[PDB]
Structures are given as structure tokens and as C-alpha cells.
Amino acid sequence: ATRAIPELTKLLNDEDQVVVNKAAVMVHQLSKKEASRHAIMRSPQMVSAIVRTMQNTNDVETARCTAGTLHNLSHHREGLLAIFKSGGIPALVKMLGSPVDSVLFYAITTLHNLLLHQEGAKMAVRLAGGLQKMVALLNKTNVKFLAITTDCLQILAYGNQESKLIILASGGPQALVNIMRTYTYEKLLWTTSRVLKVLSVCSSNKPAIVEAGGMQALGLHLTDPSQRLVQNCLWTLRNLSDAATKQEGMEGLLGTLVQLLGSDDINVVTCAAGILSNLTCNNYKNKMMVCQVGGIEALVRTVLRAGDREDITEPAICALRHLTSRHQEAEMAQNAVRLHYGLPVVVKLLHPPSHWPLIKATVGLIRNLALCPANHAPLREQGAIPRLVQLLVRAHQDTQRRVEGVRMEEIVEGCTGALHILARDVHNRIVIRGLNTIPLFVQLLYSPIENIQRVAAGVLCELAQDKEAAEAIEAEGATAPLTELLHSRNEGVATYAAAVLFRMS
Amino acid sequence: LSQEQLEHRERSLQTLRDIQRMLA
Ligand code: PRO
Ligand code: PRO
Ligand code: PRO
């Protein structure tokens, strides 16, 4: 009464144009109602007749109806199983080379459903050469079509390094960036930013996205009302920012990031801090710009607000470290940290339950802050010296014993470096000396690491300008290691070594 | 196209319209 399936299957399996043509229309109509659709599926003979004729037909009207049938079947989880087993995936991929627009939509949407809720559909699309076809079709201009196409690429690229490389080889990066700076349809931009996000953790795709103009193209959508689009852009930008220290025209992006620091959302702030840290690292220009738009003030605020969330402070402290040295306004930034009540919270971050990455970052910042004479006293009063010395004592004793992320040598250099700058102040020199550090500093002259030698000879040089300290350095037998260091290939090491041997007369 | 093929065509087109009366 309601199931005349075997009759229609035989009619689709005919060596005639108009017979196959007319039957495909009537089958397409049965899939439109959510009751007779269950009859088309669960019948393997019927679904195979469709897959065959769709891949074989030469009429325009027939290719649309057959493809729409599978599209209608793919909405139900038991339809996807029929299309997969019927061998529809290899046919639909060949159908991506179709000249007519309307059919492509049906083909791509069906493959999209298969990729989402059918086991093994990802593999089968890859092997049928679906990737190359999907990338090459990124030059189309229908926004709904492109949204499904980019999502297909995201599903196929996610957690699959081989696919990311093929997308790269087929000029994927450039095409996806182009979408970001042209189209403004939210759903397309979202799925497109999700593809780029997946691609951005690939070490070969990453530079390609950067070189195509990805950083800026992603920066365009950060003030956009859509939150899921903004977040995905941020995530991608973070992955990319370590390979972006050369890119120019960054002013707009840098300004927007400083503003995004004031956001209520942790994910937004975390990313903003991270991207800034990476872009301010060793790039002279970005350091200047970020300071000009109130980067210090926003970052201190960020750290103060963040508390003990190390995901926020670690990149924010790193950015602060970058901004407090080696640019025209570095002194200004050093003062600004103090003037925005940042010094106490900075010193606090040297104490537990802080982990090693944050401590390394915090130490390097204090080193920079201590370059400004007006920071000498407050850093002393907050207790930076005794804590730095404790990190130094413990890290050194870990080097002798024959842990997480960073090596203790980096901590040894960091603290001694920090103390070398602090020892510029006479009152700091007293505190440093009173903590029995002279013995440790002398032993540090024996270090194979030249950077440790330099900061060790540096702090000792600073301390040796006082008579009482000079005697202690001599008493610890520093003469022998210092005279060795007079001949170092490192001029800094040799200069300080001379200055200490000078003062011990 | 042939004598018998055109008979096959029209008898196949009639079957489509016969099932259309069955459902609706
Ligand atoms: O065809 C391929 O390469 C994918 C990889 C994971 C499973 N199948
Ligand atoms: O790129 C275009 O032409 C339009 C702009 C909005 C979405 N697509
Ligand atoms: O605070 C410290 O010295 C280190 C940090 C991780 C565990 N103990």
C-alpha cells in the first residue's frame, strides 16, 4: 500500500534515458516526506541503483534529483550507513568535478554529513582524492556552499598531519586567508578560521599562513560581535605568532589585542597575552607600539586580575619582560610598572604555588625592572632579593646532584643576572652580602656556561666596589678563577673579571 | 528508439503514474 520499492529499482536499472530520468524524479519526491524516506533506505538494491545512475547520468535534471535523494537520506543516521556501504563516497568525489553549480551543493552537503556522523567516512573521502577537489573548489563564491566546503576540510584536517600537508600542497593556506579578508558571512568565517586553526599547529602550514597574510586577515575580525569567530581567530593567531616576528602593518592588531586584555573572558585574555608576548619578542617596532597604546597599564591590570591563574600571568609577564628592555621607551615602561602598582604582585609571583615557567619569566622581568634606579628600593622592600637568592641556592644545588619543563641552569643565570642589576644600589649590596652569596657567586665562575660566568663576574664586580665585600671575595679564593676568566673569548666575562681583580688591591 | 524499445518506454512511464495513484 505504501511500499512499491522493487518496481522503482528496476526502472532506475534500465538502458534508456527518459525511463531512468523520470524514475529518479519520483524517488526524489519520496525522500521529501519523513516516512517514505525509511523505505528508500534499508533497501540495498534501491540505494545502489541511485549511486550508480548518479555517477553515470548525463542529464542535468537527473543528476540533481538523485543527489538530492542521498542528501535527504543523509539526515538520518541509518541513511549514512546505506550510502557508505553502497559505495557512494567515491562517486560523490567524482561528482565534485561537476560543471553545474546546483549539483555540487548536494554532493558536498552529503559528504559533509558522512564526515560528521559516519564511521570510516573520513578515510574513504581521503583515498578517493576528495581533499584536492575540495581545496580546488575554494574559488567558488556561494557563501553557504563555501561554509560546508571549509567545514569538510576542518573535519578532514583535524588530527591528521598527512591531510594538512596535502591541503598545503594544493595551495590551501592562500585560499583560506583570501576568504578571511573578503567575505563577511559569519558562518563561513567561523568554519574558515577553524580550518586555519587546525592548520596553524603544522610547522610547514604555519609559515605559509603567515606569508599569505594570515595574521592581519585574522586581525580584521577581532572586534566582530560573533564570539566563537573571535575566539577561534585568537587561538589561531596564538599558534601563528611565534613565526610572525617579521610581519609588518601590525599596528591595528596590536591595538586591538591591548584592548582585548580588558575582557571578562579568560580565553580571550589568555590568548591576547600570548599573542602579545610572541609579537613583542625581539621585535623592536612592536615593543614601541604596544607601549604607546597603554600596553603596560593593561598588562599590569591583567596580572593583578589573574591572581594565580598561571595560564594568564606567564604570557603576560613574558610580554612585560619584552616591553621593559631594548627600545626607545623601555625606561618609561619600567617606571610605568611601578606607577600602576605592579611591583608587589610581580615579586609575589616568585613564591609558591608558582611553577617554573612563570618563575623564569618573572625573574627576567625583575632583572629588567631593576634597570630603573627608582625600582631599586621598592623591589628591595617587597623582598625580591632574599627570594631570588633562595631560587639561586636551590637551582645551583640541583645542578650538582648526579625538573619540570625548564632547566635549573636557566634559573641560575636568571637570578644572578637579576641580582647583578639590583647590586647597583648600595643598600641592595648590603642585603645581598648579608645572605652569604659571595661563596656561591665564586663557585659560579667555574661554570662551563659563559652567560653564567658573565653575570657571576658582574655581581661580584658590583659588590667589590665596597671594601668589606672585596675581602670576602678574596677570602673565598676568587683570584684563581678570575685570572682564568681574564682570557675568556667572551669580552663581557673578561671585562668584569678584570674589574674584580682591580678592586682586590 | 526501436519498435520494441518504444513499447518498453511507454509501459515503463505508465508504471510510474500507476504508483502515483497508489500513494496520493
Ligand atoms: O586514509 C587515511 O590516510 C586516513 C588516516 C586515518 C584513517 N584513514
Ligand atoms: O565576499 C562577498 O562578496 C560577500 C560579502 C559578504 C559575504 N560574501
Ligand atoms: O617554589 C619552588 O621553588 C618550586 C616551584 C615548583 C615546586 N617548587
Structure description:
The complex is a heterodimer of chains A (505) and B (24). Chain A has helices spanning 5-12, 17-30, 37-40, 44-56, 60-73, 77-85, 88-94, 101-117, 121-127, 130-136, 143-157, 161-169, 172-182, 186-200, 205-211, 214-219, 227-240, 251-260, 266-280, 284-292, 295-306, 310-323, 330-339, 343-348, 356-369, 373-381, 384-400, 408-422, 426-434, 438-443, 450-463, 467-475, 479-485, 491-503. Chain A has a domain at 1-128: Leucine-rich Repeat Variant (Alpha Horseshoe), CATH 1.25.10. Chain A is elongated. Chain A has 505 residues and is mainly α. Chain B is mostly helical. Helices cover 88% and strands 0% of the residues of chain B. Chain B contains one helix and no strands. Chain B is rod-shaped, with a radius of gyration of 11 Å. The N and C termini of chain B lie far apart (32 Å). Classes of the chains: A mainly alpha (505), B mainly alpha (24). One proline binds at residues 123, 126-127, 160, 162 of chain A. The PDB classes it as structural protein. The entry lists the keywords Beta-Catenin, Bcl9, structural protein. The assembly is dimeric. The entry is titled "Beta-Catenin in complex with peptide 301". Chain A: Catenin beta-1.
